[PDB]
Each structure stands twice: as C-alpha cells, then as structure tokens.
Short mmCIF file of C-alpha atoms in Angstrom, two decimals:
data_model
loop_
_atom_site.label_atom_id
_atom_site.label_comp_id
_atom_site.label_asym_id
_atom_site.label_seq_id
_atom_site.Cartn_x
_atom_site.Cartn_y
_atom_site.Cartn_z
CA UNK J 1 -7.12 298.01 91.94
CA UNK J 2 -9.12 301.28 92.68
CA UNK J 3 -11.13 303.01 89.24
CA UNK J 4 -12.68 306.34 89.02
CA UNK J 5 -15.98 306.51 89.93
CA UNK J 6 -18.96 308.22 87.75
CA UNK J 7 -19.18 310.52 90.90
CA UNK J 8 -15.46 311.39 89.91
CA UNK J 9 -16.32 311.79 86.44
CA UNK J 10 -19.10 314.47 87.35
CA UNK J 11 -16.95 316.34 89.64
CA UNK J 12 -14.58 317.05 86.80
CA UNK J 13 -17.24 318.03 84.07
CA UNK J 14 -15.79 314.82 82.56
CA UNK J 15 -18.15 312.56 79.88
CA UNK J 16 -16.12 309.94 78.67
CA UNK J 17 -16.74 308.17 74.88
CA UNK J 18 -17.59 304.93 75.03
CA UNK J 19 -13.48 304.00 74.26
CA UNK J 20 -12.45 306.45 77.47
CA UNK J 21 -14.73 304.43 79.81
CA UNK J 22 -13.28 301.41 78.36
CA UNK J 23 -9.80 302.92 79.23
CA UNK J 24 -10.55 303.95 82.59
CA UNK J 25 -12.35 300.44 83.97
CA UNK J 26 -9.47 298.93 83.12
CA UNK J 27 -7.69 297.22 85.65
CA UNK J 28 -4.60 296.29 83.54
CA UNK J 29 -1.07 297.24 84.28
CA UNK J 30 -0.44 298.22 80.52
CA UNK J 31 -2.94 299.78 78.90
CA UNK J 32 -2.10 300.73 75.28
CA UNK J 33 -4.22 302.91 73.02
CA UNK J 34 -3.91 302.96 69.85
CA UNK J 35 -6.71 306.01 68.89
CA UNK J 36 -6.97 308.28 65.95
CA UNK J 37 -6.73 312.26 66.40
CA UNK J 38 -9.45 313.79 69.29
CA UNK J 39 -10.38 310.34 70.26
CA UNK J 40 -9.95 311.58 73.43
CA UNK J 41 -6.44 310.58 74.37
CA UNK J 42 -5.05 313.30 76.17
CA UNK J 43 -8.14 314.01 78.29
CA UNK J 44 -8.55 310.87 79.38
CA UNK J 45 -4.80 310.71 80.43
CA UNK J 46 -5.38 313.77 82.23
CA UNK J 47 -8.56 312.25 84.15
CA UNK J 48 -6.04 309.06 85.23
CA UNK J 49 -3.24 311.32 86.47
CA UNK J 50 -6.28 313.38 88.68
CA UNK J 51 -7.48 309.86 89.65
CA UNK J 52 -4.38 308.66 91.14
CA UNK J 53 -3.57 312.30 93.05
CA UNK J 54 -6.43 312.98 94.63
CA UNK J 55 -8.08 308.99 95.30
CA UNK J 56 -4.64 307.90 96.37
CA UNK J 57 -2.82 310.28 98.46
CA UNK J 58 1.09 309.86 98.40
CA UNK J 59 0.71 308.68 94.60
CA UNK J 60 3.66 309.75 92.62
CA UNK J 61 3.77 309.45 88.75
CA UNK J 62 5.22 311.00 85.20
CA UNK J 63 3.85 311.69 81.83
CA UNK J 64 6.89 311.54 79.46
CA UNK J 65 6.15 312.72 76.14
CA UNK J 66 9.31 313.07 72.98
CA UNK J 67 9.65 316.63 73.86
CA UNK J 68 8.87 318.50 76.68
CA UNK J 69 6.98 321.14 74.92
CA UNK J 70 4.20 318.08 74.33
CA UNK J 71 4.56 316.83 77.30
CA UNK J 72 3.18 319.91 79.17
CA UNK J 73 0.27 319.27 76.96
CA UNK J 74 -1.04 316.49 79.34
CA UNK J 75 1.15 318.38 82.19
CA UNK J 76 -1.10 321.15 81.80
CA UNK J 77 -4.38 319.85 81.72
CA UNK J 78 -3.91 317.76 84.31
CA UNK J 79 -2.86 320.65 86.55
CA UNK J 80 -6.65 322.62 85.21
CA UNK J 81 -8.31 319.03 86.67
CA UNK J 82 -6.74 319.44 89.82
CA UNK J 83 -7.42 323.07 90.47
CA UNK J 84 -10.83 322.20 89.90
CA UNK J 85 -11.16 319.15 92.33
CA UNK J 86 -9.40 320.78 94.65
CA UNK J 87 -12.45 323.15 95.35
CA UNK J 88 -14.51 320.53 96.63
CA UNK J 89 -11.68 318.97 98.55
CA UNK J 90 -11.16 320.82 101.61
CA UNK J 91 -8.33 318.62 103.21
CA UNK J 92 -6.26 319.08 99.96
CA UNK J 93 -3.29 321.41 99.40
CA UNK J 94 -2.13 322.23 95.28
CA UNK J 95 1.59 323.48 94.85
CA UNK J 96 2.43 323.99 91.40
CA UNK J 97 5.85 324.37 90.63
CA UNK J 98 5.68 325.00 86.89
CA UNK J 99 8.98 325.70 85.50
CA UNK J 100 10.07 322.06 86.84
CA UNK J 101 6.74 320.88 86.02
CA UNK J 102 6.33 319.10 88.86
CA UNK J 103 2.91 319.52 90.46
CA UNK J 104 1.91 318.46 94.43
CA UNK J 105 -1.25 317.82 96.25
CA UNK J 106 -0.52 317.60 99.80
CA UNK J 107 -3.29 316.00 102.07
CA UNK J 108 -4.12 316.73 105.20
CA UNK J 109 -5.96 314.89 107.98
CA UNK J 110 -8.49 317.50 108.38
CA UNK J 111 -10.08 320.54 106.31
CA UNK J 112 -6.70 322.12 105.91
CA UNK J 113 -8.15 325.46 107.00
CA UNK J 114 -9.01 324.20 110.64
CA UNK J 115 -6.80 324.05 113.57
CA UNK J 116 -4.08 321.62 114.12
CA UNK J 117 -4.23 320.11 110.46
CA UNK J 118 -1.83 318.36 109.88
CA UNK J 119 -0.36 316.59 106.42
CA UNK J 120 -0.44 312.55 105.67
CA UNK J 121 1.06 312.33 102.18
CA UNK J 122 1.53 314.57 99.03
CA UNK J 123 0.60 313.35 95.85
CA UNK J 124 3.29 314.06 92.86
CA UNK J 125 2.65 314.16 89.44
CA UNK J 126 5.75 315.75 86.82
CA UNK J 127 6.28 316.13 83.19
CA UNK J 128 9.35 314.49 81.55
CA UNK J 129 10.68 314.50 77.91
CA UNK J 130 12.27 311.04 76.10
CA UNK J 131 14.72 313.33 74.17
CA UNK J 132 15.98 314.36 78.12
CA UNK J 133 17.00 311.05 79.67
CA UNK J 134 19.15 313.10 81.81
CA UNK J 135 16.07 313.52 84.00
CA UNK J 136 14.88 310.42 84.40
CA UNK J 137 16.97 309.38 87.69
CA UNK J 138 16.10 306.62 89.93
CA UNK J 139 12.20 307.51 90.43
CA UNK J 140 9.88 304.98 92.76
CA UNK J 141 6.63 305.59 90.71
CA UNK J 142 2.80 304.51 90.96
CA UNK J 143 1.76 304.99 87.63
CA UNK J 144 3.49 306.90 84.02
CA UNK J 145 1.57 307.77 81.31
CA UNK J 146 3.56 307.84 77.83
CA UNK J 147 1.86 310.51 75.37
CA UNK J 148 2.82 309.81 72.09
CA UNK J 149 4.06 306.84 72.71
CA UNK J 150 4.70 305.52 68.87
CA UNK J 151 7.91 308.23 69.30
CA UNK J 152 9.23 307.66 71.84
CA UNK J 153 12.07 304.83 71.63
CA UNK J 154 11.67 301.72 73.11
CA UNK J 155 15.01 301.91 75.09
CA UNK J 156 13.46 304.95 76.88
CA UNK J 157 10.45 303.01 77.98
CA UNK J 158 12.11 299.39 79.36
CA UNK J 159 15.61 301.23 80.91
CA UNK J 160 14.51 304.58 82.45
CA UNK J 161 10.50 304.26 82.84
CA UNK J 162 9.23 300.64 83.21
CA UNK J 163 11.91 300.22 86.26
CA UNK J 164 10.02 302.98 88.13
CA UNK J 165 6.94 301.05 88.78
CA UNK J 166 8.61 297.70 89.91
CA UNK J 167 8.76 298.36 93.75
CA UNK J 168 4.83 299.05 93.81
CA UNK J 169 3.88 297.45 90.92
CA UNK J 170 2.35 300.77 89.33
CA UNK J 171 0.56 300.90 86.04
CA UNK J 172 1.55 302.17 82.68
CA UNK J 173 -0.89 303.98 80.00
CA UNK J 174 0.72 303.64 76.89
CA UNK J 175 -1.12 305.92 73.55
CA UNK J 176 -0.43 307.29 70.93
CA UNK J 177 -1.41 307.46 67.34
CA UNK J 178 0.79 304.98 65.46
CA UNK J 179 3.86 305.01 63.80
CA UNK J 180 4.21 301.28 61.96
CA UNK J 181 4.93 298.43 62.50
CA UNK J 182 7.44 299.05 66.12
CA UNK J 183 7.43 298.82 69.20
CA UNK J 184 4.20 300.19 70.40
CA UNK J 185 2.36 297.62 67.70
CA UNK J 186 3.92 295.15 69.52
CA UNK J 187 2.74 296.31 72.98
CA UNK J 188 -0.52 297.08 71.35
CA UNK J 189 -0.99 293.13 70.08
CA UNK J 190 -0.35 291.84 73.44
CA UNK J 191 -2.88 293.13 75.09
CA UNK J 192 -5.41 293.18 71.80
CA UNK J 193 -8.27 290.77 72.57
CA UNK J 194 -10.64 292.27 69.89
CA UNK J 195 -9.83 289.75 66.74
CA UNK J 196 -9.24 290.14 63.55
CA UNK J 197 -9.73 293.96 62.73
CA UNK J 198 -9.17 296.39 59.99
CA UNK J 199 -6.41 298.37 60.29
CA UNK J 200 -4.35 295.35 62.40
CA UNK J 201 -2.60 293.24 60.57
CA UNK J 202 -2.41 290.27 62.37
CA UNK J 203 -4.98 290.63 64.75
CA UNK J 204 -6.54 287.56 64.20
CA UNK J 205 -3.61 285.49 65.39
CA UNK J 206 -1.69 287.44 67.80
CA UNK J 207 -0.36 286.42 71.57
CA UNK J 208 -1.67 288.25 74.40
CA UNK J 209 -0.42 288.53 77.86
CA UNK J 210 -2.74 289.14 81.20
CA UNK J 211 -1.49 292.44 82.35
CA UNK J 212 -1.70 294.23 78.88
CA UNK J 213 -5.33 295.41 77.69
CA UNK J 214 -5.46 297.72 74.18
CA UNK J 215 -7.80 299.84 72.90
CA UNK J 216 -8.20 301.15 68.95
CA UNK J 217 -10.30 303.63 67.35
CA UNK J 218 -10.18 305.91 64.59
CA UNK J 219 -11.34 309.66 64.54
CA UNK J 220 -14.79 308.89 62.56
CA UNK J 221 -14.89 305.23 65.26
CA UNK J 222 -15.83 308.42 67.98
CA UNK J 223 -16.89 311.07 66.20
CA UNK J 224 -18.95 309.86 63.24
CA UNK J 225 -20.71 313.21 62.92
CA UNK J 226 -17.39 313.78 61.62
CA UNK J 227 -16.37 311.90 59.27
CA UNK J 228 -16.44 314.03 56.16
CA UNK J 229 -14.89 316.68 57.93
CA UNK J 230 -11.94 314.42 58.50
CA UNK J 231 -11.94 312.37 55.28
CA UNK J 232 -11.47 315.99 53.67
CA UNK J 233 -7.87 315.68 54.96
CA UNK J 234 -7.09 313.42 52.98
CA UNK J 235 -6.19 315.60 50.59
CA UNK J 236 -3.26 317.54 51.47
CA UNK J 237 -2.08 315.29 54.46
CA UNK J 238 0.17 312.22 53.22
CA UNK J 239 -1.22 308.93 52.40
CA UNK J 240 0.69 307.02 55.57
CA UNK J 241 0.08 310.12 58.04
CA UNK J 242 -3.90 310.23 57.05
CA UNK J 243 -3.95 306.17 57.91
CA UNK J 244 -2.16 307.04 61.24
CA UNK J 245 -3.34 309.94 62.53
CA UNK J 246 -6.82 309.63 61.70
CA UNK J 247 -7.20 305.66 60.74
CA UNK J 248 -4.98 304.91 63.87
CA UNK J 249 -4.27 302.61 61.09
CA UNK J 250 -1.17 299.70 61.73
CA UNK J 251 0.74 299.84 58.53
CA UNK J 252 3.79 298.94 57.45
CA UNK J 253 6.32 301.91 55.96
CA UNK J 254 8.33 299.84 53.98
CA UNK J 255 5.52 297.35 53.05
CA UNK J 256 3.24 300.87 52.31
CA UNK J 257 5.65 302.27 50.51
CA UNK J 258 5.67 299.39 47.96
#
C-alpha cells in the first residue's frame, strides 16, 4: 500500500501532529478517528484525498459528509491542495467542476504543455451528502472518506458506500467527533489497539479486527497550549457536547443522562 511521503508533506506546506502522521502511515483499510475539535481532522482528510489524486493517477474517490454544505468543507480544501501541487506537476491537468463538486486531475504522459502529450488516466475526487442517497449510484471507488462520520447512519455507510471499494479493495477513513455509544464506537473498538483509556469504555477488553486501525485524541491531547482556552467552554456548551466535541469522549446518552 503506497503512503505519503515527507517530500509530499513539504510540497503541500503540510506539518502533521503527531496523531495526523499516525493517520497517514497507516496502512489499514478502515481507519477510524475518533479526535476532538481542530485535532486536525479535516486537513488531514484533505492531505489523503491529494495523496491518492496526484500519487495514483486514475484514483477515484468520495468524501460524504450528512449534508452537503459540510461536505464541501473537505471538498474544498482538498481542491486548494490540488491547485497547489499542481504547480510543481507539469504533466498534470485540474478541472474543477464545482457546482457538481466533482473535481479531476487528468495526467498526461509528458509535461502537458509539450507536443504530442497525451493523457493516461484522470484522477476523480467528488463530494456527496448521506441525507442525498439519491446520488450515491453504483460508483467503483479507491478510497471514501466519511467526515462526520458519528452522523451519518450506518445504513448509508454498509449499502451505498462500503460496496464501492469492493472491486479494488479501496480504503475507508472514517472520523468524526463522537456521538455515543453507535455505530462509529463500534467501528472505532475494532480497530482500537491502545488499551484501556479514558474516555473508552471498554477499551480494555474489546475485539479488534486486522484491517481496522483507530486513532483518539482530545482538543487539549494536540493542542495543550490550549487547554484553558477550551476548558472555558465548558460553560455555556452542554455537558454531553463539551465531552464530545472537545473530550472526543465515548459516552453513553442514556447512561449520561442518568
């Protein structure tokens, strides 16, 4: 399985937390992170989606967000990556098409200025919303990327996106910031190999599987410069949503709300 490079990292302006280069050396097929607000989730989404473009010409992949309003989140940052790696990429090609969100990188077997170039595979990379299934139709993928993941519902994920990756066994990156005790907790556990852990329940005693790897931190975990600054929240953000958003705390509702 092909990783970015720290070469790739540079070209992009791109220093990854200690979490992100967790993320991307990674070889597993699901990757699910489970990482409190500006952990660096979206960015390093972003960087994958670039990866897979530009190192792997012909790769075609999604981000599917709940709405499509936060999936162009992603969507767009990804397409600011791409403008930028394109500049030092002579045999590359962007077309944006931004109302479909679907963004291409055609690549050619020469500088595409010179004479006789000639294209060898475009790249694809869209934007797709849970809450439109309509739009999820029969795709042959290499890799999705679901952005708020704790949202979106399960069915949406095994039906209309894990059946995309079967016929070349593409990879999934799965984060979010969690929402109890659901499905993405349970896709979180089987690839958590970290033991028993705050903020976890049962992470002492959970089953994991080989092609899941997961990855937790909370807000003040990467930025503990910050950690007053976010524990001032506290105060006029709900209990559960604090623990979540910030703890990328596992908890209960029902149990919490006891």
């Amino acid at each position: 399985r092909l990783r970015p490079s720290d070469k790739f990292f540079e070209l992009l302006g791109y220093k990854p937390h200690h979490v992100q280069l967790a993320i991307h050396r990674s070889t597993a097929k699901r990757r699910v992170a489970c990482l409190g607000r500006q952990s660096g989730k979206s960015e390093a989404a972003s960087v994958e989606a670039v990866f897979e473009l530009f190192a792997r010409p012909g790769s075609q992949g999604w981000i599917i967000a709940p709405t499509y309003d936060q999936a162009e989140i992603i969507f767009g940052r990804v397409v600011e990556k791409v403008e930028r790696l394109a500049e030092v990429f002579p045999a590359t090609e962007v077309q944006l098409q931004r109302r479909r969100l679907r963004l291409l990188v055609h690549h050619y077997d020469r500088p595409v200025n010179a004479p006789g170039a000639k294209r060898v595979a475009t790249s694809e990379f869209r934007g797709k919303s849970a809450d439109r299934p309509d739009n999820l139709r029969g795709a042959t993928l290499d890799f999705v990327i679901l952005d708020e993941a704790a949202m979106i519902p399960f069915s949406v994920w095994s039906e209309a996106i894990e059946p995309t990756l079967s016929v070349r066994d593409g990879w999934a990156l799965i984060i979010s910031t969690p929402k109890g005790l659901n499905w993405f907790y349970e896709f979180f556990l089987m690839g958590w190999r970290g033991g028993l852990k705050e903020g976890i329940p049962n992470s002492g005693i959970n089953q994991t599987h080989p092609d899941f790897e997961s990855f937790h931190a909370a807000s003040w975990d990467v930025w503990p410069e910050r950690r007053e600054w976010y524990m001032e929240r506290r105060l006029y953000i709900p209990d559960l949503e604090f623990r979540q958003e910030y703890g990328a705390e596992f908890v209960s509702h029902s149990g919490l709300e006891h």
